[PDB]
Design a protein around this ligand. Sequence first.
Ligand SMILES: Nc1ncnc2c1ncn2[C@@H]1O[C@H](COP(=O)(O)OP(=O)(O)OP(=O)(O)O)[C@@H](O)[C@H]1O
Ligand SMILES: [K+]
Ligand SMILES: [Mg+2]
Lengths: 524, 183, 96, 96
Amino acid sequence: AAKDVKFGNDARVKMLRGVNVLADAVKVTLGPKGRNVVLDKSFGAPTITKDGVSVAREIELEDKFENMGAQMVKEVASKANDAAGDGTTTATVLAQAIITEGLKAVAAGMNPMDLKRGIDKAVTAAVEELKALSVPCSDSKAIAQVGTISANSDETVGKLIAEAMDKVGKEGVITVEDGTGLQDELDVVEGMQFDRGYLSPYFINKPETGAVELESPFILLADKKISNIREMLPVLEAVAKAGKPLLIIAEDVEGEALATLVVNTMRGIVKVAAVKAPGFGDRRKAMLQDIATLTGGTVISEEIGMELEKATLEDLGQAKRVVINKDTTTIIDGVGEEAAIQGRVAQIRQQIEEATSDYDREKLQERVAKLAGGVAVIKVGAATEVEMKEKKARVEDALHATRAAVEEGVVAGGGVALIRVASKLADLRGQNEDQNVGIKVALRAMEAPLRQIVLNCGEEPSVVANTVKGGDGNYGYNAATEEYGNMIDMGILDPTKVTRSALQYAASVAGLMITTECMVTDLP
Amino acid sequence: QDELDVVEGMQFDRGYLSPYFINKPETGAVELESPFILLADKKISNIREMLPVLEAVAKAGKPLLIIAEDVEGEALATLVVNTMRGIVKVAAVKAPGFGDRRKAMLQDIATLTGGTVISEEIGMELEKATLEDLGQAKRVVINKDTTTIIDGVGEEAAIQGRVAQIRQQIEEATSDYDREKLQ
Amino acid sequence: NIRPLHDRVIVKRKEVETKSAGGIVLTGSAAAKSTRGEVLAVGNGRILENGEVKPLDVKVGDIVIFNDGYGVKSEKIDNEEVLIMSESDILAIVEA
Amino acid sequence: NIRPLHDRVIVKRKEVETKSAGGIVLTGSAAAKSTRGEVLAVGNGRILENGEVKPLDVKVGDIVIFNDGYGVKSEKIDNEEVLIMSESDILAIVEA
Ligand SMILES: Nc1ncnc2c1ncn2[C@@H]1O[C@H](COP(=O)(O)OP(=O)(O)OP(=O)(O)O)[C@@H](O)[C@H]1O
Ligand SMILES: [K+]
Ligand SMILES: [Mg+2]
């Protein structure tokens, strides 16, 4: 369709207006004194949130060129959310500052591509300085502090996440879900707890608990689904001779086979319980093999070659303790070689490295947490659904920040790390004067997060920024107490990955945006 | 950062038809040294037709890679079992490409590896295939996503002749997509 | 022990060949059920129209190539699967 | 060696004709399975209603035109495919 074309200062001014609309909607949330933004949702009640990426996602402007600017700067928050899961507001603030200073420079007639090159050079040097300035975050106290800061100073969230990480461990997986109660609950399950229940209710050994409890049972792992008792009959007879209980993991047990298993269950010849295998095609086999390695068994499949009529007790897996309920099956202390478990975990890690999808990688990490380490679920407690959404967003932020902190370390929060980095980069120079000006606008933009935090507290951003710059090291301004001190000592820690990612994404988008001379869009 | 990835020689985007073919678990890939290259234009489901070829390969002892439309069912299962049992290190992969392209690429692999493609149109049958019929390569890496053939044992002059034929087709070729595929 | 009647025979099927001539392991449909089996018991003999019972050409302990079909039946003697069939189903005996 | 019972015969099928009369190579369905085969072994003879075994007209070593069908069975002796069938299936012997 017919296009509206704008050039030079007019297009840049409209782009800046759109960026400013989005950034003003977002930056009111930055910092502890930051406020909440209500996002009208077509379906459901309005969402109240203190996250830059959600506000940015909702922003869309009537003016086409302003909307272009808003979408472009919205990519910053989206990318920051995708990479680090936190820092989206700091990233939007950084992008706005870079855009404002760079557009000022363009209005001064300097070459925008050289400004972009200066910004890129300053940001590369800044990333190196952040890595140098970063300190490891391995203790639980620092992890709790990081979670508390990322949860808008909610000490409970930080301590809960620290406890969860301490329990499940490094290979452990932690997920955040809604809770029925008003209080945050931490649920940690170790070993295999795949979500498959008993195929027949009558398998329940303990009625008062409504669950099957097996003591030192054999484990049969069949890749196929069965409906006849003939093929497993040697295995059942061998188990009955042994006398120990048996657990069946298979694609499906039904009809005559299932009925025979149930009858033998009451009759007492064999304590047998059968559940469905976890997952689906091309993943069911993987989870079956992980269970086999954990329990020291072998999977019965047609592809592998073995048949169930020829299966033996040695073929069957071994575990210390088993709990079957309606929703999930739990295996405790599977009798399997440790070295095999670590080898299988290493193979799954290699596939994770090969994996390029978030869903795939999270499923493999869940498998790893099933084999070794544990899995934790944080049930967010809130009185209402709007509070539930807000608190869940904050807890997810805290979890992402804690993972980033463990991965790459911590730096002083409150925008202090960027201030120190910019101070260390005062001597950085480019190939020409325009690149030098780009470096300077990047350095000045590095002060934007601290200034916006101070502004959200109602204080004077320039005075606080000057005081912080006059300090050295980790000295900063705690916005929650309106006091100055060592950011590390007061527990205001920012993951190095979060700060670095915010700076990088804001710099890339803003540097490209300042290089624009023409804008083409549909007419109104 | 900008990354440069250069793959040399034949490396089509076909993975192993069965995960259990993996000789090296820590890498999750099959590494066959000096293996025969069986190139079948038809699909495979029964082991009877390749059985002479498998017995010959076994008697020799070198591994066998089966590039065919699809190896599944009984044939795939027996190949996998024989893979663990150690009589013959056998890996089977799907033929690269589709209609008309797949044939041509099979023939290029045959020229590179000095083998012959087993097809009904050509006339030969797999029951009558011999070791001389099978191709040869110095090394073959099979992974889940792609197959790589290193130093296929084939006459150089034949490779240049086949390349010249494809060049002629490229010259005649007008469509951008087709030209890129031949390139 | 179970002995057949008339021209029927009790034969125990041989295990399917796990490996081929060239040592290749056969699995699933490749390892088809063997048509050759040892004779466990032979019936008294077939009854002709005239009323005399003619002895069967099969003897106990000789390998027989049988024809699988409706004529053959599956029965379990002492937890061991045996086939029951007429001498007609037997094609050729395997000697030496 | 495998020898048949009653009127059955062990016959080894001839290789399909690769070329036609005019030297044209036949492939696939064109090179149909030959209905002519050499006789490897002959059964003792057919049993009549009266109880006597009548010898078979076919002898060992004579070429026979056989009728492929359900009556014939495929069996492998020493890795060589042999057909098993009744003398009825044999149509005409090929002499000279
Ligand atoms: N008490 C505090 N004093 C000073 N700075 C603080 C304090 N608490 C948090 N901050 C700082 O607030 C900054 C950002 O926090 P906030 O949650 O508002 O934004 P964000 O992480 O950039 O955005 P989002 O949650 O939308 O991804 C961090 O640099 C953090 O160090
Ligand atoms: K925020
Ligand atoms: Mg945050």
